[PDB]
């Protein structure tokens, strides 16, 4: 029965994060990101944000 | 291509040092570094000029017109 | 163009008395912004030189 209990709760991805910006909403500083380019070649990344105080999103340019 | 007259940063004249620039490499055997320098281009914008100029004029002057 | 994919066009030209100059009066040839360095991320570009 443990084993099962275990199994059936899933995925607990857990977006690992930085402390340099603040959040656009609450204004704390837990910030986690990501990294990929979106648009095409010549400009960089995205730097995509995520916040984990508030759970809040932005992006930087 | 002639060597230019004229280096187009400075604008010392270049043209006579040619020859000599080859004559320097062919019987005195001489490290082209120093050859540059005994010819007396102590500036790089004029020495770059000599060092890469490559000589398309005989390969064209080979053919055989009129 | 160089070799690294910056290409560009030339915004205005100048003579040399309002070139910059070095020292050793190496007046360059052209000019190009540093901002085309960072984002294009093209190391060799500067290695080259
Ligand atoms: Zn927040
Ligand atoms: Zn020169």
Redesign the pocket.
């Known amino acids: 029965a443990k084993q099962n209990l275990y199994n059936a709760q899933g995925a607990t991805i857990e977006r690992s994060v930085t402390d340099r910006f603040?959040?656009?909403?609450?204004?704390?500083k837990?910030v986690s990101y990501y990294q990929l380019q979106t648009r095409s070649a010549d400009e960089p990344l995205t730097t995509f944000c995520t916040?984990?105080?508030?759970?809040?999103r932005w992006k930087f340019s | 291509m002639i060597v230019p007259v004229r280096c187009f940063s400075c604008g010392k004249v270049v043209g006579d040092k040619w020859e000599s620039y080859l004559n320097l490499l062919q019987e005195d055997e001489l490290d082209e570094g120093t050859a540059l320098s005994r010819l007396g281009l102590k500036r790089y914008c004029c020495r770059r000029m000599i060092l890469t100029h490559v000589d398309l004029i005989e390969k064209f002057l080979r053919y055989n017109p009129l | 163009a160089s070799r690294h994919g910056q290409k560009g066009t030339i915004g205005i030209t100048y003579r040399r008395e309002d070139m910059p100059f070095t020292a050793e009066g190496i007046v360059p040839d052209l000019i190009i912004n540093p901002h085309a360095i960072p984002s294009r991320m093209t190391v060799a570009h500067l290695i080259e030189c």
């Open positions: 603040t959040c656009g909403k609450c204004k704390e837990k916040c984990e105080a508030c759970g809040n």
